[PDB]
Amino acid sequence: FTMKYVGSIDQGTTSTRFIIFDERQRPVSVHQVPHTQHTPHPGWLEHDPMEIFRSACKCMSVAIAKLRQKDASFRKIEAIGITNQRETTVAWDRVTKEPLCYAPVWNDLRTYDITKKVTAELGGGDSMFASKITGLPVSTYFAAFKMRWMLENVPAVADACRRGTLCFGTIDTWLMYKLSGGKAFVTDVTNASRTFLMDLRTRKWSPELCEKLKIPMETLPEIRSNSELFGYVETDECGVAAALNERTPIMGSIGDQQSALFGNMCFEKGEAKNTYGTGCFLLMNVGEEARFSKHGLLSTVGFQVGRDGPCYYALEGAIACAGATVEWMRRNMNLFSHITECEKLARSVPGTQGIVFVPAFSGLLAPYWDPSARGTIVGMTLKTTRAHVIRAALQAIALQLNDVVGSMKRDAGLNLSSLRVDGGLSKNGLLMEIQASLLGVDILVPSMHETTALGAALCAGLAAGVWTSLEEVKAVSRRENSWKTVSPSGSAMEREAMIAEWREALKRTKWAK
Amino acid sequence: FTMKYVGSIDQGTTSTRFIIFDERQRPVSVHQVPHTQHTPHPGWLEHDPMEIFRSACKCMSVAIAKLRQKDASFRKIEAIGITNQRETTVAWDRVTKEPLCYAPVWNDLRTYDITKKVTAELGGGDSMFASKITGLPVSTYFAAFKMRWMLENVPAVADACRRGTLCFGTIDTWLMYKLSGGKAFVTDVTNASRTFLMDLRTRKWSPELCEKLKIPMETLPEIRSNSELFGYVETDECGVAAALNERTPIMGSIGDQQSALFGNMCFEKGEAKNTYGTGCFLLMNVGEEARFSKHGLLSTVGFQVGRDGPCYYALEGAIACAGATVEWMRRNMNLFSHITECEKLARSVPGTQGIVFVPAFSGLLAPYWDPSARGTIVGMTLKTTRAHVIRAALQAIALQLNDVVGSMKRDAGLNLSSLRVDGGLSKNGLLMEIQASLLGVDILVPSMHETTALGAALCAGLAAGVWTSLEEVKAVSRRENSWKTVSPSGSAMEREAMIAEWREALKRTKWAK
Numbered sequence A, B: 001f002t003m004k005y006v007g008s009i010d011q012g013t014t015s016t017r018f019i020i021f022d023e024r025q026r027p028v029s030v031h032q033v034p035h036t037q038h039t040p041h042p043g044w045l046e047h048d049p050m051e052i053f054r055s056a057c058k059c060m061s062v063a064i065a066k067l068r069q070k071d072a073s074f075r076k077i078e079a080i081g082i083t084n085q086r087e088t089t090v091a092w093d094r095v096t097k098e099p100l101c102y103a104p105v106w107n108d109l110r111t112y113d114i115t116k117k118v119t120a121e122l123g124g125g126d127s128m129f130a131s132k133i134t135g136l137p138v139s140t141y142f143a144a145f146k147m148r149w150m151l152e153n154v155p156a157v158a159d160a161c162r163r164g165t166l167c168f169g170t171i172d173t174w175l176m177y178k179l180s181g182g183k184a185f186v187t188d189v190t191n192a193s194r195t196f197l198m199d200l201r202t203r204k205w206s207p208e209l210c211e212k213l214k215i216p217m218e219t220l221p222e223i224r225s226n227s228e229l230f231g232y233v234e235t236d237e238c239g240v241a242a243a244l245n246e247r248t249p250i251m252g253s254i255g256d257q258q259s260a261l262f263g264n265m266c267f268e269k270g271e272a273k274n275t276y277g278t279g280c281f282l283l284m285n286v287g288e289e290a291r292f293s294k295h296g297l298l299s300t301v302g303f304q305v306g307r308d309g310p311c312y313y314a315l316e317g318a319i320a321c322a323g324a325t326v327e328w329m330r331r332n333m334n335l336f337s338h339i340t341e342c343e344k345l346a347r348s349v350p351g352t353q354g355i356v357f358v359p360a361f362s363g364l365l366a367p368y369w370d371p372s373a374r375g376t377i378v379g380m381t382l383k384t385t386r387a388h389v390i391r392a393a394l395q396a397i398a399l400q401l402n403d404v405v406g407s408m409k410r411d412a413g414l415n416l417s418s419l420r421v422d423g424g425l426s427k428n429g430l431l432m433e434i435q436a437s438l439l440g441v442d443i444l445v446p447s448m449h450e451t452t453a454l455g456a457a458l459c460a461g462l463a464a465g466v467w468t469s470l471e472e473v474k475a476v477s478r479r480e481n482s483w484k485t486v487s488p489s490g491s492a493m494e495r496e497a498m499i500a501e502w503r504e505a506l507k508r509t510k511w512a513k
Ligand SMILES: O=[N+]([O-])c1ccc(OP(=O)(O)O)cc1
Pocket: B012, B013, B014, B015, B085, B277, B278, B279, B280
């Protein structure tokens, strides 16, 4: 007769949150705790993994306490799910159970040398040399290269290898270990697919790649699915085992972007979501068979519910961040003071009237991957004003979105039936409209924006029988969490012409070096 | 003897001033009357010649009246100089003593069709066909075309020519005619060199060009030098004769840009001035023989002191968007509000850190005439701020002058000796510093910034024997009216880098259509 509840640890780049969902998929208690963004050298970023673990734990205790106040009958959480910033890589010790050093983060660039050394000496100049095993190019992001760095550069890690005590893992594995008090060394397929060490289609580790990249398989955890028993919460770090009252299984684990994909109900092929945040990503569910990319996209696991469940696959494109760009204009250029001005300034003109603004501040991502491109504005006259500039920026973000979707259609051989939006600037109507116009499809916007956290809880709830199937999940959602829907409103010669402007502008972005 | 004074009528585009100078060259009295800007169609601008005449007479009597009140040694004006907006052309009747229409202004675009006709039907498509005679390209600015336009399109002008009663003249000629009572019908070599009817080398009306453009040599006045007896003031309009008290000679006449060149003492070859106004006009003194441009620059007369005395020639170049760029950043982009904030913001960063801001809003004038070039910013990152964008705008202005100056050096076979500056933007200390650094010459900023008015006052005063030579003229200024100097303060590698970024950036400006 009382509510069943599922727990979600959302371990992000800048903070950690615990969200408790009820069986109707509503966030009923939340707590958030930030952690320190250590940047020792230009271009490095690094996290304290004990800080992360303690944050996770504080979030669970405070969230649990806040719910108890709201619902005094609630005795236990059915299960806990983990979603996490991917690729960020932790090194720890099997016996001390303690980190050997700080965790270099997804967008950290200390792995640059090692990246060229790998392309050159292991894959003769082709970045895409192992893209049929991993689904990925050689890039600074991926875990194996951070792993490599910490073996070369960090004495205690180099040391711990010798002794057979060295564990490596992405943040899912790290949290999941420490929560288990040391008893669990596992990872899920979505996180593993970002190591550069896993085979995309088998979802097993690749001895070819470990051997080549010089990573002892002893260090690596057991790959499992996203939805199944990973272990139990058995730490009393900030009272957590106490607050949970019963022993609580961890039955969900999944990378943030996939988790947003899962939690926005993109279960069918052609369904896709655009997430905002510390980084911005478009993922498309492409179906049961992997799709590789000739147009600079990543091939990756969408989700796999259960060991024997079918594996859904995805293509992934990183774009510009509406948010970063908007904040830059406000805080660096002073083109407005508060975010409400932004949309009105953009709305106050009927177009860019000639200008294009390519916000390639740290290179061009998406189907272009040009790290020499820098932020550029073209076409300005004495009549141009900050309204045009702000507008052009929002157009620019829709435009890379479109080139990325273009690339996805080609690689995947499918259409994008719908785009779901989530992360902050899904709340800008004008942007949602231009996106809607340019892609020629609908843009869904949930009123329960909390969908990244939800994915992991759905994973954990499915596994534990809170919800019974993907069908029930979808139904409860349709029934409980409402969803605004933005429809296209463009010509074709508008679309063709705005893109034509865009094409010419990109030619003028090459700057660095 | 007693104290001597010289008056200067500074007849500009938006207002007329009268400045009385004392023999130490200090402005001791000023009055300024504006006049109406008639814009009968887009791109057209014209002026009321009798309103301008009345403004000049008002300014004279008020400035005089004000001076008697504050200076008991001021008995009379020894001579009057006239400086004027060039190219603006007035048509009047020898017997009614009055205009037959309003006066098309220098930047008036009604002459467009006529100049296309002239380029094809007389140049075979080469706008430079008569540049070796005139020093000038075919353009809407120059007076013959405005003369042609009024002949063709203003029935009263056509008629007056037929009766033999039509007078054409640039503003100097008109002012000197009406002040004369209708006696003097004269022009000075600097004004005449902007007509497209003068042979640069001889300084005579070219019978061929008058014949070819079908402008009759009977409509034109006598070309004299800048400094000599032109006539006397013989009107009592707005009480001017009663105020002058004693009969007063007119002994100086000089086009505004050349007047600023003279007033800044640029008497030797290699000496130049730049007015930093809305746009920039740079003039270099190239010496005693004409020099023709192979970089699109204008060849003109600099000055001529005394009838048939030595005649110094100049090269002239513009930029369109100097102060307009500061202003644009203020009103269109909100990068700042008060005008003091501009220099403050630009100093707050050590440099542009990668970015170039090419402010070619109305296109590139200067030695790379390109109307397809538009406003563009390259090089931006998330570290970029309005401070950087502002500093880059200062650098841009300085980089164009550099390019302009570079072309003058090539055209003349001379080094830039030094650059004297005036205009509002010369008060921007950082811009002058950046400019000295790039040109590797001293920049001279006069504290008495009334340099246009002074040029004409000096011409009149030399001719009247208030000052006896140019050496004396220089001596008094160096002594009395103190100059600030700004020396180069940068490395040759910072110079060469900034110019290399500038040249790279210029290749990205092509946009319009
Ligand atoms: O540089 N200009 O374009 C420009 C030049 C002169 C103007 O008017 P003035 O200052 O009264 O002569 C106004 C604008």
